[PDB]
Amino acid sequence: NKCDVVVVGGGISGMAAAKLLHDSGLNVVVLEARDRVGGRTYTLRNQKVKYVDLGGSYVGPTQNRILRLAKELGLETYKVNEVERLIHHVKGKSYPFRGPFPPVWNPITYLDHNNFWRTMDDMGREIPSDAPWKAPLAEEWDNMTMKELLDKLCWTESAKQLATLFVNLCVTAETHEVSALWFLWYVKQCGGTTRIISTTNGGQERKFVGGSGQVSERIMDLLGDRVKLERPVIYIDQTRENVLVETLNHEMYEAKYVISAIPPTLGMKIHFNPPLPMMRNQMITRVPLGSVIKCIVYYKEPFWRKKDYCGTMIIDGEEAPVAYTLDDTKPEGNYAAIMGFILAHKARKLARLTKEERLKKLCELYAKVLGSLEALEPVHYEEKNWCEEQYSGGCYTTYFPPGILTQYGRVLRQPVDRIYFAGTETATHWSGYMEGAVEAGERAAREILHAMGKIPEDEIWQSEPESVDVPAQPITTTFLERHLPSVPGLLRLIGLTTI
Amino acid sequence: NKCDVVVVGGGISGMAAAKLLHDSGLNVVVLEARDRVGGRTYTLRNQKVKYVDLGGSYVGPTQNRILRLAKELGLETYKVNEVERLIHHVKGKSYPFRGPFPPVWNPITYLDHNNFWRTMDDMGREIPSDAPWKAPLAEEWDNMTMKELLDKLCWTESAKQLATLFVNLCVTAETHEVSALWFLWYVKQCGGTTRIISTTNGGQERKFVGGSGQVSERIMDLLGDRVKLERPVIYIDQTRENVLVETLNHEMYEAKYVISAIPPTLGMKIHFNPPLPMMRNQMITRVPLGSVIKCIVYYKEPFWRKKDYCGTMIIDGEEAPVAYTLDDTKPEGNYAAIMGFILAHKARKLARLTKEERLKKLCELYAKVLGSLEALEPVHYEEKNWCEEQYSGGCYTTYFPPGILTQYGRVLRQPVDRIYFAGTETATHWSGYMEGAVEAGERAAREILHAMGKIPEDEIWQSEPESVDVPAQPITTTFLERHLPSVPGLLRLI
Ligand SMILES: *[C]C1=C([C])[C]=C2C(=[C]1)N([C][C]([O])[C]([O])[C]([O])[C]OP([O])(=O)OP([O])(=O)O[C][C]1O[C](N3[C]=NC4=C3N=[C]N=C4[N])[C]([O])[C]1[O])C1=NC(=O)[N]C(=O)C1=N2C#C[C]N([C])[C]1[C][C]C2=C1[C]=[C][C]=[C]2
Ligand SMILES: *[C]C1=C([C])[C]=C2C(=[C]1)N([C][C]([O])[C]([O])[C]([O])[C]OP([O])(=O)OP([O])(=O)O[C][C]1O[C](N3[C]=NC4=C3N=[C]N=C4[N])[C]([O])[C]1[O])C1=NC(=O)[N]C(=O)C1=N2C#C[C]N([C])[C]1[C][C]C2=C1[C]=[C][C]=[C]2
């Protein structure tokens, strides 16, 4: 019934917010729609897999908040396998390589590839992490899709195709679906192209031993009876002295403040009194989540390692159901597995198949890419289609279509009377990730602590010390990477020699 | 408690569906979230205005369903004033004209303008009204915004600017916000560019005497106690023999079938058991409504008529709050008024002002465009910002961002077990309009009648006889309009 703060949503963001408020001495209640906590993280346990993350999983250097929270909860990380060679599969052939980037040998294509990634980061530097709509060319960039930007920037089909794969993989959406400004912001606020794409020294460096679901589960353990499962919030009333929060199962909760720790669009599932201000009312109809099926195929042994492949495959082509894989073998070397993402339109297309049909397609793909008949002999299979989730709306996160971020972006974490907004979508560093969830939950919590006069304004936004366990190497470029001309740049240099 | 069909939403679509089912002998209940019916139609009555439509208002030739429904309810139409000259205001100067199209005098600009409108209709002819995703180039066109298409097609800034205004006015959204495929479908399914833009012989020919709100109000009168106001639906349960529909005020309704007659995205306000199928689950987060403030400025007299202006103004430029106006004077010639729409980003920008501040901006604009100091002396002002409406989400209708219509379009009116889908967004002719609302409501109703074995499959989709009161003249083109080259076509000839 009565508490200090109602937190709506028991994902990482809501749990992090509730923990901070609980630790500060406030009475908190978490109202969670599902029969479980974790939201877009979900760790399945059974005999065949031991444990497997079916949602958010990877953490890496510079994600210091999730690392600190998980450490405090008694969790440990392990390194994703990147010992052996990566594979880039393009036009039906596999090309093994080392490093974060597939090598390009053609001098023109090389210039084009180099310029693309460089320009992405160049443009990113003009975009404030906490206010992308304040970029000097915000309107121009926001009124373009990523498809249009790629069309302008890439002078080779090879660069365009790889850039397209990158967008699909990063934001589980098609290039024509998403704003260029938003996508450029998204990459920049993760620390740039190298940081976001890398396993070693990047976002995919590590996973949690036992699964990421333990973060939310262990906070629930600490909070005990304060977490209310199967309590979908349907109604928030702010007309009276205390905020009234009603659930689908007829329960009423009274609080001084509310944290909304759900994906922005899922705010639509709540009826508000009084009605939301116009900008938020419309914003929450304009911010969809992406489309993905996470698929894990299990094998007797990590046979790819014997062929000097680490299990990472970058697979281009419309025919391939999965565009990207990682070795998902346990740190102990057992429960050998390949994790793959079925992205964007392919998630839509292939969801029509049975689980068995998808497994067959994945195995046949892996067999060609790895050039191994062993890939046709899976021992087990797990998958999760996040598009079907009423209380997620998709995965990994919310994307912004053209025109939305500049018009509605400033509303995202603007308080509505006594409602404050968490959720990874409101983060300014690794928004979209578990890291962003922690940043947002704790920031929203501190906004309430400030509103109560418990902390100064200066303390709402808090810096995070670097993890000692997961140190971050700086992102470097070579002299040539910095100064080599683009394709049109080289052509302009040829045009000048003609005179 | 118990009935045959629960209709969720008491706008024109829900009311039309409920009326059809009621007339067929079924027990129907309409659950309406607001303290009123009408939804995106709303007629305000007071002493100063008599009546004024603050939402949907215009009807015209080829919109035979709304005309028939309104007639049956005892409503009449009158003609919007287009006797005198229209005005095109561009680069700070007013250019009076006659006919539906503002003239272009620069020869190259003429070719470019002509080609743009012609190409819009050409492209539309390849788009099936009932399945736009089946267009031969559906994917190509859906993966482009209207901004991109305009950038490709328009060789002059003049044509591009007017085309932009057209998009903003048509769908209350920016050109960069909307799919080219969806927009081209939208125009085609209203009967093409001329039909959609025209007052005389087009969508804006007429209004209802007494206001369009009377359509929903008069059906509510017929249904009586069957319409439940202030009953926002929060929960639909289809796991049992009968469908259970729960409202915010704690009431439970049991039915054999449900019609959802709300904007697709407002389906998000309902928790579903079992969960919606994946495609619909995601679709309803991908389909926003546009942004508009409808503003009506009242004057002592329709002074513009004295200067041989009808009151229609097409106003170019970022500075102008309103891009398009019509005379909103009563058929009797009193309650003189100019109606204007504040569109898309301007609705967002100008909503920050006070009502009085917006009035001042509108009056100053009208004084400039009409060249009349009389515009600075309003006697009254009414406005409605539809962006603030929890149970509409915007106006006039739902738009599709790039990539959505091909991926999710087929889900729009696909039944989910015993839930059938109405709402103007599911119409195939004048979707977005009151006409589409009637088409969709009656079609959804008939789907249920078929499911009950009461009518054959052949009768789900029903043709509508042409209105005798509002006859449609055919849309014609001239030989030169058909065969004059585009700008790149002329350059290829050179
Ligand atoms: C799904 C997913 C997947 C599949 C994958 C992934 C992911 C996901 N991610 C993301 C994460 O997960 C996120 O971010 C988080 O989790 C979020 O959190 P938050 O914010 O908290 O949210 P959520 O969870 O959702 O929660 C919410 C809650 O609430 C609730 N509700 C609703 N509604 C309601 C409620 N309640 C009451 N009432 C009402 N009404 C619900 O239920 C819930 O619970 C991720 N992340 C990270 O970090 N990591 C990872 O890994 C992940 N993942 C992914 C990724 C991928 N990647 C990275 C890729 C690979 C390679 C590459 C990439 C990218 C880029 C480059 C490269
Ligand atoms: C808003 C608006 C405005 C401002 C204007 C306009 C409009 C609008 N429009 C549209 C109409 O209105 C529509 O379409 C209709 O109305 C629709 O119907 P429906 O489908 O039925 O829907 P609604 O109304 O929305 O209803 C729904 C209902 O439901 C309810 N709910 C929700 N949720 C819920 C509920 N319930 C229970 N539960 C829950 N959960 C609500 O409340 C409601 O009631 C229009 N239309 C026509 O026809 N006309 C007109 O006029 C209109 N408007 C406009 C237009 C414009 N224009 C035409 C322009 C001028 C010149 C030109 C143009 C365009 C193009 C070219 C040229």
UniProtKB/Swiss-Prot annotation, chain A:
GO terms for cellular component: mitochondrial envelope; mitochondrial outer membrane; mitochondrion. GO terms for biological process: dopamine catabolic process; hydrogen peroxide biosynthetic process; substantia nigra development. The modification S-8alpha-FAD cysteine is found at C395. Residues 1-487 are cytoplasmic. The keyword Magnesium does not apply. Changing C3S: No loss of activity. Its cofactor is FAD. Inhibited by deprenyl. The record marks C154, C363, H380 as: Important for catalytic activity. Coiled coil: none annotated. One of its GO terms (molecular function) is electron transfer activity. It catalyses: a secondary aliphatic amine + O2 + H2O = a primary amine + an aldehyde + H2O2; (R)-adrenaline + O2 + H2O = (R)-3,4-dihydroxymandelaldehyde + methylamine + H2O2; a primary methyl amine + O2 + H2O = an aldehyde + H2O2 + NH4(+); benzylamine + O2 + H2O = benzaldehyde + H2O2 + NH4(+). The modification N6-acetyllysine is found at K50. Pfam families: Amino_oxidase. Changing C154S: Complete loss of activity. Its EC number is 1.4.3.21, 1.4.3.4. Changing C387A: Complete loss of activity. Monomer, homo- or heterodimer (containing two subunits of similar size). Each subunit contains a covalently bound flavin. Enzymatically active as monomer. Catalyzes the oxidative deamination of primary and some secondary amines such as neurotransmitters, and exogenous amines including the tertiary amine, neurotoxin 1-methyl-4-phenyl-1,2,3,6-tetrahydropyridine (MPTP), with concomitant reduction of oxygen to hydrogen peroxide and participates in the metabolism of neuroactive and vasoactive amines in the central nervous system and peripheral tissues. Preferentially degrades benzylamine and phenylethylamine. PANTHER family: AMINE OXIDASE, AMINE OXIDASE [FLAVIN-CONTAINING] B. This is Amine oxidase [flavin-containing] B. It comes from Homo sapiens.
